[PDB]
Amino acid sequence: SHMEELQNKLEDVVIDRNLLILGRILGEGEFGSVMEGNLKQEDGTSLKVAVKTMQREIEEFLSEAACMKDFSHPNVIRLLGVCIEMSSQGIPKPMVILPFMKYGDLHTYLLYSRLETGPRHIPLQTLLRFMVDIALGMEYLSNRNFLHRDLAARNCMLRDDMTVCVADFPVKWIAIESLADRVYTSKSDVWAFGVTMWEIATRGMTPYPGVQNHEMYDYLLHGHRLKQPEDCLDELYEIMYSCWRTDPLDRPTFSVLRLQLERLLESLP
Numbered sequence: 001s002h003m004e005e006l007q008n009k010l011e012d013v014v015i016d017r018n019l020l021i022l023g024r025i026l027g028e029g030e031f032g033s034v035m036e037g038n039l040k041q042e043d044g045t046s047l048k049v050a051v052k053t054m055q056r057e058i059e060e061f062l063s064e065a066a067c068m069k070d071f072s073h074p075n076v077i078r079l080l081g082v083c084i085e086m087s088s089q090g091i092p093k094p095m096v097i098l099p100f101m102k103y104g105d106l107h108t109y110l111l112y113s114r115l116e117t118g119p120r121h122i123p124l125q126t127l128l129r130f131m132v133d134i135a136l137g138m139e140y141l142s143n144r145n146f147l148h149r150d151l152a153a154r155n156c157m158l159r160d161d162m163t164v165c166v167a168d169f170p171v172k173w174i175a176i177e178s179l180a181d182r183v184y185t186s187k188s189d190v191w192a193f194g195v196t197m198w199e200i201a202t203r204g205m206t207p208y209p210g211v212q213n214h215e216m217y218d219y220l221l222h223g224h225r226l227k228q229p230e231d232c233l234d235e236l237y238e239i240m241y242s243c244w245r246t247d248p249l250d251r252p253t254f255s256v257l258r259l260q261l262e263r264l265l266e267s268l269p
């Protein structure tokens with residue numbers, strides 16, 4: 001039964017606050033903060049973790065976390081669990097526990113690769129491998145009919161073995177139909193994926209250079225799309241362009257995109 005399966009997922013997702021130690025702030029936004037932490041594991045040893053801090057909304061957070069914790073794919077970030085701490089003002093402070101990624105987010109990695117002390121120049125073959133990794137994570141989520149809604153290179157994390165995983169599930173990433181009638185589908189995530197592939201191929205450029213966020217709906221409506229990057233194969237550009245076809249039904253699925261990206265990668269020496 002669907003209910004008993006949700007009750008199990010809820011029991012599995014909560015981490016006792018005594019098993020966690022909070023460290024330094026890694027990042028701090030408006031919606032919350034990211035801190036380093038230590039999680040005491042079942043095997044009696046501690047693991048370095050990243051801790052993100054934000055009745056109905058609490059239950060909704062828990063239910064959503066219970067679903068994400070259930071995800072099991074190498075290209076999807078693992079949710080280790082959640083804690084609910086209470087602020088001095090009696091305001092709930094939900095915390096989400098994730099593996100710590102020393103390499104950080106993909107967008108920052110890309111930008112650092114263009115600096116001397118940062119990682120070395122990323123070869124085309126490795127940039128394509130990052131695209132395959134994200135398509136695999138998205139294929140997993142779309143098959144489970146789970147919408148990401150904020151896919152961008154900044155929301156992709158690099159693991160220690162250089163595997164990319166999708167995480168955190170922005171006008172220049174939003175599909176033409178979601179700007180026009182609030183409609184959001186799996187084909188809208190395919191559009192954001194095309195935009196993300198373009199960010200990887202330009203090594204971190206902000207999409208639509210020279211175009212202002214308020215000019216975006218008019219720009220797309222008139223048929224304009226992201227331009228081909230200088231260091232990008234024609235085969236790759238066609239793939240990212242197929243993500244931005246006006247009619248969402250004409251856009252390929254993540255499965256189709258993944259296979260095209262894998263084939264192009266295999267074709268490279």
Ligand SMILES: CNC(=O)c1sc(N2C[C@H]3C[C@]2(CNC(=O)c2c[nH]c4ncc(Cl)cc24)C3)nc1C(F)(F)F
Pocket residue numbers: 026027028034035050052098099100101102104105108154155156157167168
């Ligand atoms: C220069 N990079 C940054 O400032 C970024 S980007 C980012 N995120 C992108 C998306 C929102 C998300 C929050 N973090 C995680 O979910 C992490 C899981 N595991 C990690 N291990 C390390 C780190 Cl740094 C982060 C995480 C995923 N968070 C930072 C942070 F933490 F520094 F504030």
